[model samples]
Target chain A: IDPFTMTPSEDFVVTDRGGIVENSHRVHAAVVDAKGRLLYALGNPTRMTLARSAAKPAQALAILETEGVAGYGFDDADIALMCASHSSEDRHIARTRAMLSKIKAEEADLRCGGHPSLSEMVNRSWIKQDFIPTAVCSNCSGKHVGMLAGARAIGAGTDGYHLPDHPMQGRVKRTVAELCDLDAGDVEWGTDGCNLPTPAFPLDRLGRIYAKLASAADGSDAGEGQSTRCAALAHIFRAMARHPEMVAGEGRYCTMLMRAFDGALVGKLGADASYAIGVRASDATRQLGTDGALGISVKIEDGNLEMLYAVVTELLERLGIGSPDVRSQLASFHHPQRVNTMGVTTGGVSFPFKLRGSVDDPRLAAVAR
Target chain B: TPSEDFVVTDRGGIVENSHRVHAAVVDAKGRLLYALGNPTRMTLARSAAKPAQALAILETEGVAGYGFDDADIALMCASHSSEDRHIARTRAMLSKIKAEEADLRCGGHPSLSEMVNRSWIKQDFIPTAVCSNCSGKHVGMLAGARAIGAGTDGYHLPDHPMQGRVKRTVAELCDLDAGDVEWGTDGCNLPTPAFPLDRLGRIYAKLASAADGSDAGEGQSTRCAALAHIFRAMARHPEMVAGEGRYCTMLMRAFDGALVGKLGADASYAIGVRASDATRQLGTDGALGISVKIEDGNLEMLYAVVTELLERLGIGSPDVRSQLASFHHPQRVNTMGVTTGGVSFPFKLRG
Candidate 1:
């Protein structure tokens, strides 16, 4: 229940010469099945988690259920962007603006403004061109535009859509809770950087939502309202897998990871180092004792993404989620060797934690279909 | 000393995510003023050592021999963003010695600022040794080697003549004998120094006082004049010190010459406040030097820790510190841009 009482169950250590520990991080993660049952975990999976942008797909699903975006003539790429923490690339910006145009919303109608960009290249361009970023340039612009369409889908006005109490936000909250199988009242709300409400819930629930994405994509789930919600979920997952660029941007981890996996899974990154992946049901899923889909969520308490990425890669290897060559594509990011600016190997990173269960665990075996 | 809380959280801090930070504050004399955690914590000073290392370049008369201007001297002390202007200046300095980028040991390390990364992406231009953020420092080494009448070969090594000079100079500045300072290889493939964390504070404190108190008039030691030039150049050309939107550049610009600061790799930082200003603010008798090292090597936390230290010490103007207010546990806004709860600073200093 209380996060502060929980001790993190994962560690990534960085060391000085001769492997003396210089720094370390305490991390948490969860792997769950379609039913939101924890299949494997590190730390307390039930700790209340602030999922940040990791909750985007569920939020975008709320918009889809509104049929608002489809109502506004927005397309699949637009759905992918709604779930993005994009690099604010020109492509991202143009599509964001196009979505706004579809809804007749001005850039001024959006609440979030730009901050320093996530991409080094794009940020520099912002500086050199003396260009001031408007609302449409926000990394969360697609989400904002998506929410605006959500308002219209329900035949409501768009004003104050970012307010926690807004009708559109209320729908987002309810839909977020439903996806994770939590009661709406059980979810705590926080204000997002883009001025909309973000939700907090158990870490595994985040994994559950992503797992549902994979289940929806494969038509494996005969869950409640399977016919209607499944089609929409399938549409959302396909959009993300097909247009990973719109979901993130060039050379980003989420975009690249999707490319590396070749759409067998969908991954997304959250601010302050939260990340999740929904792996489609396949023989590869046998690593976790099932040919059923799996969802994974991990949070680095320190808010450092490199450690987050490193931990995720280690998890993938431990879970045997993909082929060694397939996972090896992440080598550019899984850079454990710490080479200094002058090209000297001063120190390196080491994993100092363990997953509590095994790939062939009885707990997971019991859940096998 | 104990590491205190510099926060980023909200709601009676129920969802608190606090980063524990260790820091050191000292006067120009290496006298500890206040601290959080062990002020004497042994630390690798990293790029924070630039100002101290630049002294070797100046004392060897490299600036004079190469006719390098003040901006050039600032670049000599820089771990720049590798911007067009920064690259241009480095190129001009190399031309003075007719040194090729190939001779530089720090090859094509990508610039940290996306601003420069944007240029490289646009050109599809792969970075070379010259594009290394610290090329300014290495190129200055080439010029320093030629100025000292030593061969540029292996100048990056600790046993090399130029590095030997730097080792000696850094030791003395930190109030250490060459033997007392611990030496290790830095990221730039050069010998870097480490010592009690407070010593780094003293190094910058001395830098600020030396620059502010001396006028380059008769009989001022080469040490004082060079320190003065280093401070003057970095302060006047803050843009050259780092680059667009960097903490080093932004902090120096915000202070507007009241102090000078720089960051070392992995969250190491130091700043020297002018004796006249810091003394007046501390209501004390001397200039102040401050150093902060976040054990985890996280910059987001480092900025908050440094900002909190400056605010707590009353070292800079309120407006100046406000420029960095966002990093100082500013807000907990999510992706939706709504104000959530707030950050909490739960720890205090031990004087």
Candidate 2:
């Protein structure tokens, strides 16, 4: 994060109309197994990176570890939302209120503030009502509410749940590092847009977080004696897959991707162009020589979301992750047509960089071609 | 007690972001006199470089043979708005050449203007090739190709005779070796090129220079006469260059005829300030050409720096600049309608 030692960026994604590159992005990404053995990488994967919302599943683990799940009666949808970077739809708003009610906590107890809705259609509906969002309307309100419940389970007052020194936050940081196989003190911390403490670690470790989430449910990666920890991960993973709508709203990439995959994987987008995806072991995973689950993560140099999604979708294709039916559904998601205000199809996005295999992993030759 | 409210504009600590831009100023002689960022930054001036491309129309005698009027010539150089006027005149131009909408190589896109886009959306409208912002240029190319007895088909290709001539004319107008300007495809699927920013500035300077010398014997080259014609046609029919409320149309309308300006995609802009005593005071014997590039390719920031640079160089009248006042510098607002910070021009041109 220090400017004095900033990593130089390499061009990855570019916007091209005809011959000239209109706009290009310098990007970074990482792929690894649950134990954090790097398999393939791009552009300084070891760079200090904030997973942002992509680490929510890991953060939500703190709540699940407590009796908070059964004590507060948090449903699967509630658990799904606890890890969501949601679009703040009416449905998402309703489920968040239900979680708040479970803790007998009012919306006033939420420390996070509501910003604008992520979906354009939601904004239009809000405008029709001249609506001003409250704490419950926040995209991260579920996470905050989950923290209130978790803190209550531990006898910490709900008042400062967002504080870095709070007991719930202590559990959260430890849980995240544990998921990445790193010691709790090995990562940096920063305040997120949602007014919560976020952890920063080497970008590739982010892949392990999602890899655990997917592998927990897939069970093929079920290790001896670790099944108990994987059981907690499996429950959270099943909750998200079953209630995909609660994870994201209409027209959102997370929702669209999950629905299209039909629970073959779990994906989450983080703020500032950080993203992660976990794919359960399948023939596709075997093709890459990963017999269990595989995890992948990316952080764009400039934090452009369009570039992020374009690169993420490109990675899925380049890695041969899904069946043809799955890949065909994402065609428009990749290389979105460039239209000016007048709506002319002026240009298109292009992914030009190929991810390099770590230690020349022979398995990646399937994709490196 | 909270008197500041949420409307603090550009106050210290409220602004946490900045966008960088590059600008180059040149005289009609093609000398870079002032620079911002890099004068030699090889840039692509997309739709902004249309006037020179349209020069091929006159060079091949397409206008005379097709009975094209001034408005047609103006539209020929337009990255138009797809307004009624833009579309109607485009249809009319096609009619004049006995060509159909089917003859156009470019495809129709949604209207670039919100008013037109909204109206089209309400009607569930699907535009054909003729509704394209670049349709005028495609039609003009077809006509130009026909006049030279070259095949009108496949005119969009770089190797086509019509495009081959356009490629040659662009290099000569910018005073560069043909090999120096690299060719690329435009948004309209036509061949466009990238050269130095100063070369793009010089291209506009030639237009302003020819327009400055419309009747003067010293400016009476056959090429200069055609450029003079190009300038007057756009000036007389500013609406034909771009539609209502568009930057190209508004800028040309505001300056009246003192300069001709064009906008490129991704924030490339070039202007030819018609030879004025003010330009002469800046030490140019004739007109001055100005070009700007925004590294991020954001058009909003591009226009912001474009107007600020014009003011920095004392290019336009204060009154004329005021017409575009709102577009350049104003309270920068968020989607929530809060004006948290305003824009600033941090760069001074390097002499």
Candidate 3:
């Protein structure tokens, strides 16, 4: 099989019925079962894709598996938080500083230099103050701080963890490739804006990993909530949901959406419009009979971050994965409307997504359970 | 004669079209004291919004927190000429905060006509936060955030607490609601807010009327100290605000460093001078603040008209007038198979 292939049978097309608003862009979305079966696929899911920041969690998982946080005295939430693209809020920055100080590292030790936070409002107000924020002020700085810790845990030199060929990075490649059912040699690597090695793999494998993340079984039947992966995924989702303010900080759309959703789902956005979601339904296992973990990955070729949210929200609404209140929380992205001072109805872009197959289709019907 | 189709108008009659303009002047308080094109409705102050934005930065980030020095503060409040000094200063500011060149995302373009005339290309050096046209303001906000004990993230958000404070401050200066103001991301990736043209005048008036801790005599520990200090610094170190051959810096120096001024994009300008022992209060209704825009929207034309307005206001000398004569009476050229037009305001101010 071609490593980079898009099987159309596994995809869906959302249409606007040829209004003045035509589908000017193509979006690739898919869900795969735990067994690597393509449940639903559409568009160019087989493109050689760069997941960027979306792959941080898997990298953190690799570090966890390698005992990278062991004896380093880092907790699971700390590990999970380290894997985040935080909003550079005070709490997030404080936590990152604490993590760094614990390792005897300082701001100079961080390779990713300070850039403006993703939020524009923050940059403007900060600019006037002549603020000299450090790397910890960056939303992705948390992840870099964690990688520094991971390097020390694995007994590798922390000097160049951001490099593509570093030992810690080498282990990251192996771990992610293994999870995606690909050989380490098969995956391509590049540097991310946050100064970490980003991975490129077949896009559908992205969906496959999420499937495994959602379905990883808990060996102990303590009747507790979920497995480590499941719980970590849930915790991230819940944290974003409960404290959306912590997600992207002030004046950011990502932070707002998470606040509205309040933890029934966990979504993370990558630069250039890449997004991944892992939804945990209380009845997910009951419907799929023990292996029915539902995982979704979507990418827009045009790199429209707003459009990705639109499609994701539409799918969730149709699937009834969350309550209407939860789905309605995404209205800003779904049917956004903007008007000028003259009230001339100046700026409103219509969303373009359609449900082709019946919700009751066997593949999807099985997913809701 | 140019056709009426190209003629631009605010609430007044024909503004400059293709050439030539009228004079308008106002005091620091945004009050219309003179007019050439119905100054009451003519909203010409666009570039002047930079200072207010810079002021917003100071109010949010306190002085002590961002670790910004005097020069860095000046750059953030500047409409720099893109000179080597300016560029070098910017790179240094970015370095101070440990930012990378790749992270700047300001891209590249010449900001001053002198740089353009010299055909200067931006080198690979990373522009520091202070080098940003808004660097002075950025540092101020960083300080404000530190003062408020707020986390540095997303403080630039229009909805963030810091931005909210900025909105109120700017609105109070401009005599508008925070809601009436429109906000968008500026070219440098900061929030840019817009309001009625005359509001630009009000902002300058507030700057001129601003009082520093030193001026307050005793027991003057106030939040307004930063604002007053920023304006004082601009007035006292006019050269630091904008380097040689730059309009913003030269304009301040032409006024003998007694005034604080800044510019923004799309033809906005503002100037604020201290309310002195000789002059009374300054406000929108009491003091005259000038804002001008040419319908053709040429930046050169805007400067020409500004020089003309300043000359009519009688604020400077023959030497000062000669120094700014190039801006007042500009020269046009058709060179290199390109027809380039230039105009300069031929006027001087005498007090």
Candidate 4:
């Protein structure tokens, strides 16, 4: 099916005492095995979607391949920040500045522009202090700094590093396609909000890419160049999972989910409600056979972030991923409470769709209950 | 299935959450202009009834008899935060009436201002009844009782003569029969009234109209003049009506002299907007009263919805709207301070 032409069904409903106050529709999701095979699908699994910030890990991989981090003596925290859509808090900004200095670069070299902070506290403080934002305050500054270092390491031009045709971007595109097992020519490209070149492909290709990330972390691949690449992927996964706070900051879904799952899974958020998760080959994957690892990608067509978190939580629960305690920690996102300024309980937002397909598959019997 | 109550939307106009809201709007003649949910839903007036309660003092000419000024009248209508300014004013009001803190029947809690409350805790200070936000109301009641030659003992009781006067004044201003106004005890232990939500809007509408002096009836001129006096008192000393940084104070400051809004306990709010040429052109007499009740008692949502209501009515300019943006479009942040999404207003005011 041509994914773009398919009409999306209502996926979430918000209701108060009077009735349904709001309705949101359209979430396209896909689950894939380590070998790039789609096991489950919803909406249009083949729908082409912009990788956006969700492709940060792959971009970071390109920088790692150039030995940029190690040559500059940057640590795992730096790796985690590079793979982040951080809240741009004090710690995130401080680390971003430190990373740039370590690479012998200045803030003016970053192509990203300053925007209003995503962190409410930081924004409030900025308003109070009459603070002027700089490129160092961008949520994606760590990624840009890492790219600058990578450019230096590879003897590429740093001046136009943010340009789509820059050699660094070329490496990033190749790395993303390689991880998804897609030929370089097959990947479509677009400019991201952060001024970096992003990739686009079928929805399931995203799942496949994340599946490989998880599988690599599990050491399931052991052939020559594959082993080295796998080792780097494993390092990135460990750093992200260990310092989840550096990935997104407090109370954010990416950070909270990773913290709750306790390293069993890694998740990333892209702009406009795109999400990807990599589940290690642990108990959760036992039901799907020795697939090595599992990957899930979801796109909320309307970009309703609250619904995205709800759908993601429901997916994890259905897959028997986290323990009950872990799931409870995420209850606020799964079943968001509708409140007013007075702290009164008014109504609720609810997930209204069940995942389609393989309901009768014996492999899902344990969680199906 | 019955429809859901409230749906919270985000900046993109997508439904991101939900809640329940009940509201009413009326013109000076007590005509309902618009409504949402149940307009006539019986709701406790709570602190929203303070203006009418303060009107009792005016009706008795207590301000003149006791030599009280506009600030004193403003304090009488306040739901202040118990800041140092509010406390000092309350003390001065008591002194003016030759009454003591012991005469106030209301109990006190710590200051509502977080900054002041922290200091009170650190210093181990015990608040008295005179420190209550409702202390000004109590002091005004004492003066009213004395103005009418009634004793101040048991003044807080429902059956007291002073309380009786307040109930009658409230019922009259609301255009309701005396029997229709039911009594309930307020958080400050005063006799609060329960009436149809629309009647509360009507009361505020008349208050604004009286202040504007736009619709003076022959027989009602004296009462209208008294209402006008109370409105002027509240408008002239908005800070005394509520303390620093409060919604009431901030909203009044934003509108300058054009609007007066008061917040009640439990998310009830009433606003009186003076008539301007612009408002008069829009079918209202340039004076309006808006009342809102958040069924879930969420004050943040109440403020947001109220701000949206003002926008829908075209009550203010772009600058005026910007001044209220924080209230109208409150940014929702998680504990980590990340702005995820925020409450959105989807429903327009329906006639």
TM-score of each: 0.78, 0.72, 0.47, 0.59
Q: Which ten residues in a row have the lowest lDDT in candidate 4 chain B?
A: B9-18
What's the lDDT for residue B343 in model 1? 61
Identify the superior model by TM-score, candidate 2 or candidate 4: 2
- Candidate 3 residues lying further than 4 Å off, grouped into runs, are A1-23, A217-247, A250-262, A282-291, A355-369, B1-351
Best by lDDT: 1
What is candidate 2's lDDT per residue for A1-369, written digit by digit as tens? 432322224436777665566765566788877566777777777766777788889888888896645678788889889978888898888888888888888888888877778886786566556577777888887888899998887788998988889988988888888888887777777666677777888788899888888888787335544565788888788878777778878788888888889888888988767899988888877887677888999877645687788888888887889866886676777778675433446558877675666243343232211
Best by TM-score: 1
Please report, as a residue range, the 10-residue window in candidate 3 chain A with the lowest summed lDDT: A14-23
For candidate 4, what is the TM-score?
A: 0.59
What overall lDDT, based on C-alpha atoms, would model 2 receive against the true structure? 0.78
Predicted candidate 3 versus true structure: per-residue lDDT over A270-336, tens digit per residue:
6656676654544643344335666667776545565667766766665556667766766777664
Per model, the share of native interface contacts recovered reads 0.43, 0.12, 0.00, 0.00
Write the number of the candidate with greater lDDT, choosing between 1 and 3.
1
Cα shift from native, residue B170, model 1 (Å): 3.4
The DockQ-derived docking category for candidate 2 is incorrect
lDDT comparing candidate 1 with the true structure: 0.79
Kindly list the per-residue Cα lDDT of model 3 for residues B222-305, writing each as its tens digit: 445666667766776665576777777788777774566665554545666554422332223333455654432356656766
CAPRI-style docking class of model 3 based on DockQ: incorrect
